[PDB]
Amino acid sequence: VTIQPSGVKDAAVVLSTTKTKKQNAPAKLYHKSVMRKEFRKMAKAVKNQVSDNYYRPDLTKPALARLSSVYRS
Amino acid sequence: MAVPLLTKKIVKKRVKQFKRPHSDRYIGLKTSWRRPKGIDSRVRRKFKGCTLMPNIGYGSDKKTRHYLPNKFKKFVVHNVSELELLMMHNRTYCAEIAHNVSTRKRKEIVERAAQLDIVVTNKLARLRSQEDE
Amino acid sequence: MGIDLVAGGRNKRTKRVAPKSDDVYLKLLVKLYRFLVRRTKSKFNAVILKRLFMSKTNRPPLSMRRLSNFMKGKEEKNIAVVVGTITDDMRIQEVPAMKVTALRFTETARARIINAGGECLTFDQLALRAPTGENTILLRGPKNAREAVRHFGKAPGVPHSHT
Amino acid sequence: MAPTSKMALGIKRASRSHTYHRRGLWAIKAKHGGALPKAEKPAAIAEPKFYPADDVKPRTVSTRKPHPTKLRSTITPGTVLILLAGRYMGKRVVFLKQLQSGLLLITGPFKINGVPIRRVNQAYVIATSTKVDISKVNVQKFDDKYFAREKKTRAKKTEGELFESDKEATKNLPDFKKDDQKVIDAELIKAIDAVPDLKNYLGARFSLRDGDKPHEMTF
RNA sequence: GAGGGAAGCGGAUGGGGGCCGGCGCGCCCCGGCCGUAUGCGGAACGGCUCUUGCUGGUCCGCCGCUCGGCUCGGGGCGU
RNA sequence: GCGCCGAAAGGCGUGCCCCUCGGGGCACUGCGCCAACGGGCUCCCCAUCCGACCCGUCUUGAAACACGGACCAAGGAGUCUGACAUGCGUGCGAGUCGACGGGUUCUGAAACCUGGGAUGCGCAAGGAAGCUGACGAGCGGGAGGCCCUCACGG
RNA sequence: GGCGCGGCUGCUUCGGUGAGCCGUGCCAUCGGGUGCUCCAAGUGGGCCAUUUUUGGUAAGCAGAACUGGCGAUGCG
RNA sequence: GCGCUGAAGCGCGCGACCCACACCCGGCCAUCUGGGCGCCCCGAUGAGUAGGAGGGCGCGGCGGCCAUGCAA
RNA sequence: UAGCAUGCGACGCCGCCCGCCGCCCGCCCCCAGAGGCCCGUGCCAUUGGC
């Protein structure tokens, strides 16, 4: 379930990441994209600034890394 | 910490094994434990050699509770979806594939789990669908 | 060991979140008080909490009359804390003002107090704007009143002498 | 109580001195405690961990305290150990392990063709002049590089150094053989001569390493 | 499993035998891939305001201009 | 632990004072946080104890020479709702309370709107029966605010 | 709890007194072993020991008192 | 019980020992003291028939949610 | 009278035995009113003159 934002791991381009929020009653956003391990850190450290507490977003970085490792071989 | 707590339930036990009393001398009379109900009962009298009765103090340490002896926490996995959560745990948790899940289904879970880096019970059971020594 | 100490295990255990509060909105309110209570000066909110857990033998109707004589301007129109509910039973042209706070009011009581003065406040808006809970009168019961203490059973029950 | 009174009687006193040397240098050890230290890439996770530093430093010290002390109760050097008896000169062994006192493992090298090693309740050992800081622990059985010969030439130098003392000292030579025969052992007389070490100990230290890790052993 | 010389609520408690399921780190060289800053071009966001507006996103498409890194394996070393 | 020597342990800043010998106690910033080496369970037997069967019941007291069972699988006991009294909870709250009809879908169901049956228990009572029928007060303990004056406190 | 001030009252001579009441001010070896309300239980047949008994030759009797235990309490 | 006798009887003194689940100590389970952030922590008492009071396990069919199945 | 199952003796002793030994694989683990190998290599253990 939602709070006001979510952040749910998947994606299926070979090499992929997922970085969702949700915000506001109509807009109903949810983006998925990226490759690289650096760009994985960065646009979740920025997400931390605009939200809070390191440990969960940080964890949902190698979940993705392991998925983008797996989709190689 | 954990290692010691795991060892305090597993190598001590308690394995008396609480069997119903005199279950052995009638076959039908079932193994499942029943409280010795009536006054003369020696077990009821809560004697030693009489086999201990169940009470709360007998209980394991919480830190060691519902763990496999491996000390991994088992999580039952119906399908691939449960796998995501398990993957997060990885180190913490072991995945156990339900008996029901079918042979055609079982394959996808197994491979996904490895990629997840949650090798546990599942490997054993997949060689168990293959045949084998 | 002692026997004293066993009797010491036999004190209470009053303790209760009530079996259900089916209202979720009451159900959240009743928790809020243990976070806020040890985190402010508010003894009153800590009392309301016990009395909105435990019982129906405890939950109060308060009439507009039973506010009305009893608030009477000499603790000068403070905030009146009614744990359970207000009920509509008086006509005087009622209260001299008033900020009344309760779990529930009837709609007639809501209408009559706000057209006399002040506000019929809800307890949560009270917790927000009066978090200290001081200048406040805990007013009151009942189930403790005339009808019914032990006056049960059929035709009762009596002063007593016999029953 | 007699050792333990001495510790008290500042409190700290040297540890009140310690600060000072930093105070003397100039103005300091608040800034350096707060401002430092490292960090920031990394991979994953909580970083719950660990070691080197500060606790470890009392645990090594603490572990050093039986270690003299058990020798004060039982008297001697430490390891490395020589056959007194047997062959007049001959060769050198190190006490890697106690099954017990008495049942002991005495050691060496073997990497190509090799060398034995014995576990004994005895046969032939009295100690020398070296000390380490272990008691009598290391083992399984490992060593090797030059060292049937080196350990052994290290033996010759100790066997010369000993053989002269065995001439000066003994009751004679025949029950230095009964002393060597014993090998529990121990208390009575220990410290004769054999001066100095500096090589003997360096050699012993290598021997301990060699009966440790990481060579010849890994798959 | 055990046995034709030693005593019994048939269990308990201890021990042997018999049976069985399970089984990484630091550095360097080669191969591989990609890159941001800035200019372009497209786009969810945000603090907030709440008629409305101002500053602040991030990634992608993909060329230019500097200047670098990662990952799967292999080879050595140290842990 | 946070400078140096010293393998090691240990000392190396300085002031005070007692002893006035060896020495002693006493005083003087913050901050951070180990070594070595390479299994479960079933049945049996021996030791040891429960041990007095169990078990359940009856009983002051059960191994019981008190009662009941050959052994097992399956069956085999707080049900139904009314009244009267309650506990716990929730909606409205000096009334609340809805059948039956009709209106209308799905459904043999049922639902929803609505007149609102039915007129309880209430809203105040007494008593054979006439018939009658106010609500003001504190006192004490002891919730809590204010005045103050704030160490207390009245 | 004690005192004073002030009103009202009583019983017992158109007689003597306090007490009561209200109002107002003043001054004063333990340690939760604990109160109240609703609803429910087996009962509503005991035993023994110790102490004190009464009957009875006595009794592993009968029948009380005061208490600790068994019942419903393991373990040594 | 074997069974002792200037004791393995008896009495008067005495020394050292043994021996419970007691008491201590270590670690842990309920309730309660409470405390602090749906969760963690400090200490105490803590046998049990009749039995009250409270939390939970399992059965079978129903509904909404949510899956599993050619090997249930 | 009974009585080798007190875990006994003797006499008489025989489709392949068993008498005496090479080489290997399991169980318990002194007498005694104080006492119980000459020259050597070799850390060892092996191994040689005697």
- Are C66 and C145 in contact by the 8 Å Cβ rule? The answer is no
Kindly list the residues from chain B whose CB atom is less than 8 angstroms away from the CB atom of residue A66: 87, 115-117
Tokens of A42: 């960065």
Q: What is the DSSP string of D92-138?
A: EE-EEEESSSSSEEE----SSS----EEESSSS-EE-S---S-SS--
Phi, psi of B30 (to 5 degrees): -90, 155
Q: Which is nearest to A18 in space by CA: A7, A6, A5? A: A7
User: CA-to-CA distance for C39 and C32, rounded, in angstroms?
Assistant: 11
The separation, in Å, between residue A33 CA and nucleotide G47 C1' comes to: 87
D105 touches D99 (CB < 8 A): yes
Distance in Å, residue C76 CA to nucleotide H14 C1': 88
Q: For residue C131, give the 3-state DSSP assignment.
A: coil
Distance of alpha carbon C111 from alpha carbon C99, whole angstroms: 13
Q: Which residues of A touch B117 (CB under 8 A)?
A: 66
Cβ count within 10 A of residue B87: 21
Chains C and A touch (3+ CB pairs under 8 A): no
Q: Is D17 exposed, middle or buried (0-12, 13-18, 19+ CB in 10 A)?
A: exposed
Tokens of C133: 């809970």
Tokens of A69: 């490792």
Resolution for this model in angstroms, one decimal place?
34.0
Q: What residues contact residue C143 under an 8 Å CB cut-off, 6+ apart?
A: C56, C57, C58, C59, C60
Phi, psi for C158 (deg, rounded to 5): 140, 170
Q: Strand I: which nucleotides have any atom within 7 A of a protein Cβ? A: 41-45
Contact A10, A34 (CB under 8 A): no
Which candidate, C79, C80, C67, C83, places its Cα nearest to that of C26? C83
Taking the CA of residue A25 and the nearest CA in chain D, the distance in Å comes to: 34
Question: How far is it, in rounded angstroms, from Cα D40 to Cα D47?
Answer: 12
Amino acid at D14: A
Burial degree of B131 (CB within 10 A; 0-12, 13-18, 19+)? exposed
Q: Which nucleotide is nearest to B37 (CA to C1')?
A: F56
The helix (run of H) or strand (run of E) holding residue C84 is strand C79-87
Experimental method: cryo-EM
Residue A41 CA to residue A57 CA, distance in Å, equals 9
Distance CA B78, CA B94 (A): 14
Return phi, psi of residue C147, to 5°: -115, 100
Specify the pairing of strand C79-87 against strand C99-104: parallel
Q: Please spell the DSSP secondary structure of D20-48, one letter per residue.
A: HHHHHH-S-TTHHHHH--------SS---
Cα B133 from Cα A40, distance rounded (Å): 44
**Closest to C28 measured CA to CA, from C122, C133, C120, C109:** C122
